[model samples]
Target: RDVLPDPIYNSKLVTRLINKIMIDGKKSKAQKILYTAFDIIRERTGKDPMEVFEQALKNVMPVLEVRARRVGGANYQVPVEVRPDRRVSLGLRWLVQYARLRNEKTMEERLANEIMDAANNTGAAVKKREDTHKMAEAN
Candidate 1:
């Protein structure tokens, strides 16, 4: 399937978020969700929405993650480098996952709140990134 860019920002990242938010083949619903959240982000911050969204993704993206490696008799947590594509996918997944868990009246509100928090490096997504880095370091 062709992954078209978002209508508003013509951004692949926005389209990726919309795809991540999709449920049961409801692409339109996902787009609406992201668009509403983007509007809320603009209304609340009075700044460049795309810039904030990109910053949030940057803040949430993990540099390294652990993968199980079998070393003969035992398993080891091998630190693997994240690919550029996988990094964006992981960031989007964490952002949407944590946003859905937040307390809010609507998905848009929750997503907006999470996006703002992530851009400021204080959201669950950022915490997840930090934890992943720590685990990779420990291993």
Candidate 2:
């Protein structure tokens, strides 16, 4: 229930992102991967890495989640609003998840590519965000 700002960005979002990318309790590796990805972002886009990253995160945060319910065997499907905080958590996890799924040579490359794709409106995370709404519409 406690959090601090990241060292470089000094934003809690970046701190959360680092934790999301961390594995095997290796935060040092996580930080390196994230920072290097941001470096690539800056190099390729010629923009502020922070700005690009924030936009990518916002792009993938879903608004609605389809939920299924049943009472006495009557199944119901409906849209539920995502929690404000849950939105960030889901966005972060989805971004990291898709990064790992990408075929880039390294985690940093995958992360950089995924993040750039999200900001430009063309990443797996962004597609996943819309699919959540699609389920609601289809139901």
Candidate 3:
């Protein structure tokens, strides 16, 4: 996809999340969900949402993962560094994705919960990072 920038934040990174959030072409509510989440993040953290967003993204990105996982290949999965292109792509994508699956009152709150969790410690997205990399030896 040829990525675009956000009008609200003017961030290409922010735009990417909404692009993924868009389902059945309902970008209207998708952007709101993210917008609301950022507001909630600010209220909860007393810090700019952008800072937490970046920290959460960085925390969830793994440097290494199993390059291959073949059931028939009777060998270990050699660990390898992720490309810069790929790392944050997966970081933001998986973050928003798990937030979608979160059990919260609204999508906005769900995303906020996920963002805070990832910033301070771990969430589903961050867990998967460890999961995949822990398989640097096996899953």
Candidate 4:
């Protein structure tokens, strides 16, 4: 796979995040949303946006998650250790998914809010990770 670093931060993670947020092959729109969200992060925290962004990703990455396994007539939710690639993918997915569900007037605003919440360990993305851990524990 050929991956390019994002223009502003020049990090592949930011590039991946932009791709994750893209829809209908509208990459430029996704980039716009991400950059605007980063701007909001800087404005609110008065810190480096890249640092806050990475922290948000770290905060939501789950160490363990449950997977379905079928044997005989029963299906079991087996707890499995998350791989590095899968962990980052899941974190980005949850962040964008929850941001879309927010009531904010714009995608940029909603994404910024979600990223800020994740950085503080209080967003839907973080809650999703917690819930996954709980489910793994229960199984």
Candidate 5:
């Protein structure tokens, strides 16, 4: 399977988003959807989509998470620090998955709305990250 770089920075994160957006192996459609979403964001917010995406990611990245570690035959729910890469991965996954669940008619609409909400600190993905933070706090 062949993959194309994103239109902007040509970064792997864009490639990853394209891969995630692909359904039934339709890479071209996925790229179209992502591009449309970015265009919508630019039209609505009058800012760069890359900046909006980065803002959303920063808003959603978690510092800590609970993990089950087995020690002395007992599983412990240890609170561990989240690594930088894992945190970024989690943030992107949350945003994309939540965007896919939005009520908009088009994928672009859904993604644009979710990205806006996340950037403003008021999306489902942001809430999910907040819950993770609370869980970590309880540990």
Candidate 6:
């Protein structure tokens, strides 16, 4: 087993993040961006990147999610409690997905900015989480 440390801390969250950024089994580039993002987090916020990342995920993860449930032969959107693992997965996905959309100068720049935005709880990822919460409430 190749036991490599995650670019941002030793947390499994960073490991999962690597998976999201990996392309064609090339993980070096993904590790570079993740490490750079953590460095930016430290420079900008004067805080540990792992803590910032964890807080970002906490802020962006949905508490409840809506699922399609068939009742009486009709499909209904039922609000369900989101699993902890899935919540983190969703949060990470939102962060990565929104970071890719930014019209920034570089991938590192975009990723860093997105992480900062998320840590402050005022980014696209947080907005998406809020929307998901609202949708679950509505359902």
Q: Each candidate: what lDDT?
A: 0.92, 0.91, 0.85, 0.92, 0.88, 0.85
TM-score of 2: 0.92
Badly placed stretches (over 4 Å) of model 6 are 1-8
* Clash pairs (backbone) in predicted model 3: none
Tens-digit lDDT track of model 3 for 33-133: 88999999999999999899999988888777677555575764677788986888888888888988999989899998998899986889999888878
Q: Could you give candidate 4's per-residue lDDT for residues 38-87 as a string of tens digits?
A: 99999999989888888999999998999988878899879999999989
Flag regions of model 3 displaced more than 4 Å.
69-77, 137-139
TM-score of 1: 0.93
lDDT string for model 1 (68-122, tens) is: 8899999987999999999999999999999999999899899999999999999
Model 1 segments more than 4 A misplaced: none
Q: How much does each candidate deviate from the true structure in C-alpha RMSD?
A: 1.6, 1.6, 2.7, 1.5, 2.4, 2.4
**How many residue pairs collide in each prediction?**
0, 0, 0, 0, 0, 0
* Tens digit of per-residue lDDT, candidate 5, span 12-110: 777877776779998788888888899999999999988898899899889899999999999999888999878988888888999999999999899
Tens-digit per-residue lDDT, 20-55, candidate 6: 766678779888888887888889889988888888
Instruction: Quote the lDDT for 73 in model 4.
Output: 85
Residue-by-residue lDDT tens digits, candidate 2, 1-139 = 9689999999899999999999999999999999999999999999998999889989999888877778688978877888989899999999999999999999999999999999997889999998987886676
Model 6 TM-score, all chains together? 0.90
Worst 10 residues of 2 by lDDT: 66-75
Clashing pairs in 5: none
Assess every candidate by TM-score.
0.93, 0.92, 0.87, 0.93, 0.92, 0.90
